[PDB]
Amino acid sequence: GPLGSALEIAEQLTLLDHLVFKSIPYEEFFGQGWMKAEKYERTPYIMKTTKHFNHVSNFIASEIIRNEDISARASAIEKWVAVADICRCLHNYNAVLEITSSINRSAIFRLKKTWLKVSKQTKSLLDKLQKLVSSDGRFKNLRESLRNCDPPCVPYLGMYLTDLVFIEEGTPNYTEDGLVNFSKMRMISHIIREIRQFQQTTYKIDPQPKVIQYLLDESFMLDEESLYESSLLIEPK
């Protein structure tokens, strides 16, 4: 049934989400290297995490847009929102953001006639989910949800990256005397430590090759412009 499909997609998505997240050597969190031009060389793993996030998000919007008629389109959306909710229960906030941000693309949001066919339970569920992962207040709700969270868990990495940039830009590496500012080293470590905690505990989920194959397929991917262009053909302005 729907719940079952949604469940295995969320579990396999979570395994993939967590694996990319866990492979980031903690050294990459030093010196906001992901903000430099040498990012792909200096922070290849953080970049892989970000790449993975855009892949999943694009995979979802593409599948939704490529659905033949209004009802299959609506049900694809209901399937994904259900997946986002299950991911929220598995504490895979990363997927919650990937999914809600994807479905929120202007190309999908403007599909007014399709949204009429989406259940009010689904629209309600989406609203709660977007609130949970809202970027307002530097992801206030998400940060709070993570504060009281026991792994296994997959946070949204961007939130921590931003916190680190904030510390990097606001405190000097060295003191006025030219000595290492240990105060700053500890501030940075404290953040890296929470991250490592979530990277270390793994999910007790067996992989499912067929589901994984489905999720890793790129054959139907549509870029940003193709997505909005297709949208215009499905529902003219």
CATH topology description? Son of Sevenless (SoS) protein, Chain S, domain 2
* Rg measurement, Å: 19 Å
- CATH class value: Mainly Alpha
What order do the helices and strands follow?
Answer: HHHHHHHHHHHHH
Just name the CATH architecture. Answer: Orthogonal Bundle
List keywords for this structure.
mainly alpha, signaling protein, Cdc25 Domain, Ras Guanine Nucleotide Releasing Factor, monomeric, Guanine nucleotide-releasing protein
Structure write-up:
This protein has helices spanning 2-22, 39-42, 44-65, 70-89, 93-103, 106-109, 112-116, 120-132, 136-147, 157-170, 182-200, 209-216, 224-234. The chain is built from 13 helices and no strands. The protein has a single domain, classed as Son of Sevenless (SoS) protein, Chain S, domain 2 (Orthogonal Bundle). Helix 10 (157-170) packs antiparallel against helix 11 (182-200). Promotes the exchange of Ras-bound GDP by GTP. Residues 6-237 form the Ras-GEF domain.
List the helices and strands and how they pair.
Elements: H1 2-22, H2 39-42, H3 44-65, H4 70-89, H5 93-103, H6 106-109, H7 112-116, H8 120-132, H9 136-147, H10 157-170, H11 182-200, H12 209-216, H13 224-234
Quick description:
The protein is mainly α and 237 residues long. It has helices spanning 2-22, 39-42, 44-65, 70-89, 93-103, 106-109, 112-116, 120-132, 136-147, 157-170, 182-200, 209-216, 224-234.
